[PDB]
Amino acid sequence: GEQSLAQTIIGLAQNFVGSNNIYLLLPNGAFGTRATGGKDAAAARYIYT
Amino acid sequence: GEQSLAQTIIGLAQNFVGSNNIYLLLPNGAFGTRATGGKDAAAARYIYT
Amino acid sequence: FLESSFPGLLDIQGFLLEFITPIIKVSITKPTKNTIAFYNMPDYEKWREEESHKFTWKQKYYTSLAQEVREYFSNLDRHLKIFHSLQGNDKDYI
DNA sequence: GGATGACGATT
DNA sequence: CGCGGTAGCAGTAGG
DNA sequence: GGATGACGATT
DNA sequence: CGCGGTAGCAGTAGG
Question: A44 to chain B: which residues are within 8 Å by CB?
Fold first, then answer.
């Protein structure tokens, strides 16, 4: 499912402390915060990378 | 949202009696049936067109 | 779930069934025309290496047009496979 | 005689 | 893998 | 000392 | 717009 893949991408992009020491993708939008471990993140139609 | 668009496509494809007199797209998969008015249809990652 | 929740259920022979579907669908286009449905990798491969060159064709990775489904059910005894009732070292493996 | 629901593209 | 909420109009059906 | 939950890619 | 269910392992935390 494309959903799982989208989540994989978001995961690769996240830039809140405690995620990726070096994010290979740039979180151009609400790619989640440290407040919930990236779970806050917005829907794919929202964020860019 | 891409969801609404996917639904638009599915709608353009449906080929059960009572849908499209001439479906401009081909329903290559479970594009819904007459049993629920196309609501049965399967998820986008499923069907092709 | 069946073996764990229900004792002696999987002992009944011919209770659990399986509906299977061909893994790939080949279509012959230029030379002569028919369609070959393969149940597995080995068959499709032996054919792919020992017959494919003799035609122009297209392979379809395994939704299938309902009219083919009707066929799936017309002779479903070929697509139906039965599990053997628990025997030694069946439960153990489960 | 007023209420509820279907339909569809969008949140 | 799947379920749910809301707008907006015209007309039909249900008590 | 047994139970519940977090994490993550996929149904 | 949004919510929920399940597998699979290792170890931590809660009662």
Answer: 2
